[PDB]
């Protein structure tokens, strides 16, 4: 709208791009980084790395990111209310630069420890970012536009996944020599945000409420909203303030202890479990590895195809979530992912008998990814926001986010263990989970 509003949102969702890039960058170059792990292991000890050790060490490098994300999401409120939304985003680029350097120089340092540490730290940054950007974009934008502009967060997530995937081709940075730059290149969005943010406005909601500077809030609203009559924005921020002061902010402990909040927080947690325990990130962490075992032509291209499908259905989901009930779209998603995970299993199990089953795995994953963005992707966050009023809602989101990261960790840390143990029957484990989550949602989850 305004122009200065574009700059503020644009500089904010760079971190959304960061969130997606760091999510799906470790997929395509698994084999070349695993080779480095082995090359390091023989350099230190003289023997080749054990295959199960390489599985654990590489799983940890993928998963330690989620351990960091749980901590950062948990620390969002600490930073956002003390330093502001804009200054916290600026400040936290320190985390991105520290992580780019640890991962960028891990090969020079011959240290998978550095890489794992960098993965942990860039995790903390992303858990903080996925709290910062929605708040800032939501508080900086007009009321009529704050809904549409909010979608740029998840748009930047999926676009950044796609960029990391494309950058993972052997033809560019996804190879033996340039994979440290592939992990390290996040400093370019980071440096770019450090330059833009000092020119972005602080949140008017933050200046008016958290710091009690009405006149500075008014001045920022004047720049964000070109017209001089910003009293409607001021009154709404005051009207939202009075409504937010009507309820006492429930703590996490109170949420679990109160029989009035024990059931709604159950629906919210299980719905976050249903998003990650669907195995969505088996795809975005390991699709290149699983496509290779599926005999796919060129796995990295099939991976990129999933990220293209992921972006297309994220864009498609934005126009469908407000045209159907949360309950229906979540079950449709869980059901589609269940069938695609079945097709994935029959293709994996009939590959030795039929070579063209490699193409069926590409179709299974494309639809597995497609059904996710329409249901299990966004909907767990819709119900939790509509299950709770302003009083308990912050604590409920914090608990939801901790359930998300925790089950993300489980998949990314354990998928390869149950892969070398179940073979072509790994995705039935996801079908069994999806089906349980399906009957749970059919019985326990109300429609909002
Ligand atoms: C480079 C590391 C990250 C730096 C982030 C902290 C910036 C500290 C200064 O903040 C600014 O102080 C002014 C004077 O009090 C306020 O007018 C303004 O609202 C506030 O934004
Ligand atoms: C302020 C926005 C609130 C609604 C957000 C809706 C979009 C949620 C998308 O889910 C994300 O999908 C990625 C793959 O696409 C996964 O890798 C990631 O683990 C998962 O969390
Ligand atoms: Cl701010």
Author numbering: 8 to 455
Question: Can you provide the manuscript's text about this entry?
Answer:
We subsequently solved the crystal structure of human GLUT1 to 2.4 Å resolution (Rfree 22.9%). The overall structure adopts an inward-open conformation that is almost identical to the 3.2 Å model published previously (RMSD(CA) 0.4 Å). In our maps, we clearly observe an NG molecule in the central sugar-binding pocket in the N-domain, despite having a sixfold molar excess of glucose present (40 versus 6.5 mM). Residues from the C-domain coordinate the glucose headgroup, with seven polar interactions established through residues from M7, M8, and M10. Next to the glucose headgroup, we also observe an additional tubular density close to the binding site that fits with a polyethylene glycol (PEG) molecule, derived from the experimental setup. The position of this PEG molecule matches previously identified inhibitor positions in GLUT1. By replacing Cl− with Br− in the crystal it is possible to search for anomalous density peaks to identify bromide ion positions which will reveal the original chloride position in the previous dataset. The chloride ion is coordinated by several residues of the A-motif in the N-domain including the backbones of Arg92, Arg93, as well as Glu209 from the SP motif, with hydrogen bonds ranging in distance from 3.2 to 3.6 Å. Indeed, the D-glucopyranoside headgroup in this “secondary site” establishes polar interactions with Arg93, Asn94, Glu209, Arg218, and Arg223 from both the N-domain SP motif, ICH1-2 and M3 residues.
The human glucose transporters GLUT1 and GLUT3 have a central role in glucose uptake as canonical members of the Sugar Porter (SP) family. MFS proteins share a common fold comprising of 12 transmembrane helices (M1–M12) with a twofold pseudo-symmetry between the N-domain (M1-6) and the C-domain (M7-12). SP proteins alternate between inward facing and outward facing conformations with respect to the central substrate binding site, and the transition between these two states define sugar transport.
